[PDB]
């Protein structure tokens, strides 16, 4: 066994020497002559109220009006953030739901939590309500994030150290993604739906190819549990958020942390991370009851979105990148713009 | 507002009317987290209570007309730092202890240090159940297992003056009983700082009063929360 492990260390030594020789410059000095982002003042236009417990997760719709929000009361509420209306309410079997996704067709909403089941909800039903379209089961851990690929395929990150691509029409795993040694908290799909990064609690993020179920490449540099991960808008980079009060930007072509977003006054844990439509304003979401807005190229705060009363569990930017919805553990969601 | 907008604002208000009806259900039920070890009688505390009154099992019991949800974990893994944050607004935590065994008490104490001090599991009180008192009673009278080996502070210890021994109990058993409580209470009375409280109870396996013990403790918890709303505590 010791021949295997020492071989594994010198592969880590070969990778780290390859990454060190790959870094001729850094993003701090490539972007040191561009104009500063300035102060981005940003306030709440819509305080979406009506939840009964902590808003654990949300997901925007692709039309940038509809959003679903998951809470620990056993409800998914579909919201119209333009008018504060409640488009739908979805009661659940389990009130411990840790994620929800909005499909990019408007036809389905997933949810999943400690019940170890991804429940797909059919919204556009002829009979006139929401029902359980599919109880996707097979995981042996809590589902922490799920995202719809296109209308019949979903990848679910779970607490059994695995990610899994599921066919909703059959209920089965087409492919399974294994390799993480810890709890997997978040996943993010690239904007051509062929690769996805998963951030887990082993201080590493793995890029997976969804088409044959393998890990391309593993990204280290974090030093605690990654609770948040989000792709850059082009698809060549991704940022991460974790408990070490740092956010780190990882390019998929050159495997390094190009920038750490970390001040000394911040001591808490990042729970949610999402970029803008251009990837200039990395909005992160922390445990200091606040949402700091980082410049993604210069490592300075552009403003703090401070309107919440507990941990901001979820944070999402629209697909036209124009409103930010931050949901917290105080049962309120807030539309910043 | 248009004709379809004003009916959509109404359809929000019927979802207000449904969720205010479900807020009546949610506030009148009290979520409790059953988190104990495998050696302990955690399944017995499920079984005894539900007759009298999947990664989550859910036990509901009704004592004096009020609702009491109890959740314990099944298929969840042994890593317990990310899913434990979901139970931050539960009314109480039932920490069932196998007090009779001694090689796994300190593992339960380090479990108890982790729950009591956590930044999101703070403000949650713990209803401490110290199960297997009947087999602890047989073991101390047998005298096979020496507590002094595992804990070298059972030698300079004496039984407290405020102790309440049940009749027909040997003094060594009562000394063994209240030692395990005081190991479990100097964890709790060192970092809470009047934010949450520990309620220790010496319970038998087949005892039929654990619902009343939870209800008497849960009455205190929501009393103390209401005093903090006037800052009385």
């Amino acid at each position: 066994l010791d021949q295997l492990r020492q071989e594994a260390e010198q592969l880590k030594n070969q990778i780290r020497d390859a990454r060190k020789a790959c870094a001729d410059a850094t993003l701090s000095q490539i972007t040191n002559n561009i104009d500063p982002v300035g102060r981005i003042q940003m306030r709440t236009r819509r305080t979406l109220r009506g939840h009964l417990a902590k808003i654990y997760a949300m997901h925007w719709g692709t039309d940038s009006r509809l959003l679903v929000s998951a809470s620990q009361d056993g409800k998914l509420i579909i919201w119209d953030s333009y008018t504060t209306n409640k488009v739908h309410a979805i009661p659940l079997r389990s009130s411990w739901v840790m994620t929800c996704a909005y499909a990019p067709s408007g036809n389905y909403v997933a949810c999943g939590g400690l019940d170890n089941i991804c429940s797909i909800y059919n919204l556009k039903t002829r009979e006139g309500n929401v029902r359980v379209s599919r109880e996707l089961a097979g995981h042996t851990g809590y589902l922490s994030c799920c995202r719809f690929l296109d209308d019949n395929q979903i990848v679910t990150s779970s607490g059994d150290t695995t990610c899994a691509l599921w066919d909703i029409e059959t209920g089965q795993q087409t492919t399974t993604f294994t390799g993480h040694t810890g709890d997997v908290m978040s996943l993010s799909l690239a904007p051509d739906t062929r690769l996805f990064v998963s951030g887990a609690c082993d201080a590493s993020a793995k890029l997976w190819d969804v088409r044959e179920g393998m890990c391309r490449q593993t990204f280290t540099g974090h030093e605690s549990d990654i609770n948040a991960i989000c792709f850059f808008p082009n698809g060549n980079a991704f940022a991460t958020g974790s408990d070490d009060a740092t956010c780190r930007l990882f390019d998929l072509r050159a495997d390094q942390e190009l920038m750490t977003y970390s001040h000394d006054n911040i001591i808490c844990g990042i729970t949610s991370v999402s970029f803008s439509k251009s990837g200039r304003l990395l909005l992160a979401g922390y445990d200091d009851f606040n949402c700091n807005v980082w410049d993604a190229l210069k490592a300075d705060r552009a403003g703090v979105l401070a309107g919440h009363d507990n941990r901001v569990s979820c944070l999402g930017v629209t697909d036209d990148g124009m409103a930010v919805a931050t949901g917290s553990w105080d049962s309120f969601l807030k539309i910043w713009n | 507002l248009s004709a379809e907008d004003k009916a959509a604002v109404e359809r929000s208000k019927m979802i207000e009317k449904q969720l205010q009806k479900d807020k009546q259900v949610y506030r009148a039920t009290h979520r409790l987290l059953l988190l104990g070890a495998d050696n302990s009688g955690k399944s017995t505390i499920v079984k005894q209570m539900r007759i009298y009154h999947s990664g989550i099992f859910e036990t509901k019991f009704q004592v004096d007309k009020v609702n009491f949800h109890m959740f314990d974990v099944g298929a969840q893994r042994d890593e317990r730092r990310k899913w434990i944050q979901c139970f931050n607004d539960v009314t109480a935590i039932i920490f069932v202890v196998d007090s009779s065994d001694y090689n796994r008490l300190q593992e339960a104490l380090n479990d108890f240090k982790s729950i009591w001090n956590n930044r999101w599991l703070r403000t949650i009180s713990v209803i401490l159940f110290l199960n297997k008192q009947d087999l602890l009673a047989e073991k101390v009278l047998a005298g096979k297992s020496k507590i002094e080996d595992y804990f070298p502070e059972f030698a300079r210890y004496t039984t407290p003056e405020d102790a309440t021994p049940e009749p027909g109990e040997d003094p060594r058993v009562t000394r063994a009983k209240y030692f395990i409580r005081d190991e479990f209470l100097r964890i709790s009375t060192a970092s809470g700082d009047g934010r949450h409280y520990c309620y220790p109870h010496f319970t038998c396996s087949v005892d039929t009063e654990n619902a009343r013990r939870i209800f008497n403790d849960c009455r205190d918890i929501i009393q103390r929360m209401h005093l903090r709303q006037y800052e009385l505590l």
Partner: single-chain antibody
Amino acid sequence: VQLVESGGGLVQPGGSRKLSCSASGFAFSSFGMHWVRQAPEKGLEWVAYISSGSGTIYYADTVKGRFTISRDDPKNTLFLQMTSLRSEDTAMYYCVRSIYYYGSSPFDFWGQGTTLTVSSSSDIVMTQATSSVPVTPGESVSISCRSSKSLLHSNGNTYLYWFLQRPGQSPQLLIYRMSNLASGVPDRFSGSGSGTAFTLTISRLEAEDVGVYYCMQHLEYPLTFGAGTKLEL
């Protein structure tokens, strides 16, 4: 999803008849439901609307003080009690299903009809000027529509709905809110317009699309329907 109607017959003038449409196949409390009547050799004219979980009761001008519409949510039945029936009441009345939210499909399912034979301004005129059109299978026909007042609200949704009434069948929703396509409709149908003037375009006209085509305004509360555009062969 079935909306079968009861009641209706040979009612003497000045009388009173109660019409009930039963709903087996969809949830009743989630849908705000209308009554639309069809005169024997004329068009469609809306008479009533009750919201889901009744809060606002809208009637037309000619049926305002004389008709009442009520809603029985447990028994899945929609009631229309009528008083003082004039001859014009003569018509076959449709039970109409409609939900209202963002992206919803109002007027999607219509009933079947119940024949009622009575014996011997602010309203938006939805003019059509398209009584008849000689059509052949395969060509691309255009059906015109004009409104007296502009239907483009400040939201951005222009409230124009299209219906297809087959000769021995109920009307069926084709496109709603100007051009939103309905679920069972083929991709042949397409809608356009500019707020006041409107256009429906059938591009690959088949045999089953024979019928009278109706327009709609859902902007103003009193709904009005067009005279009809008959695509005869």
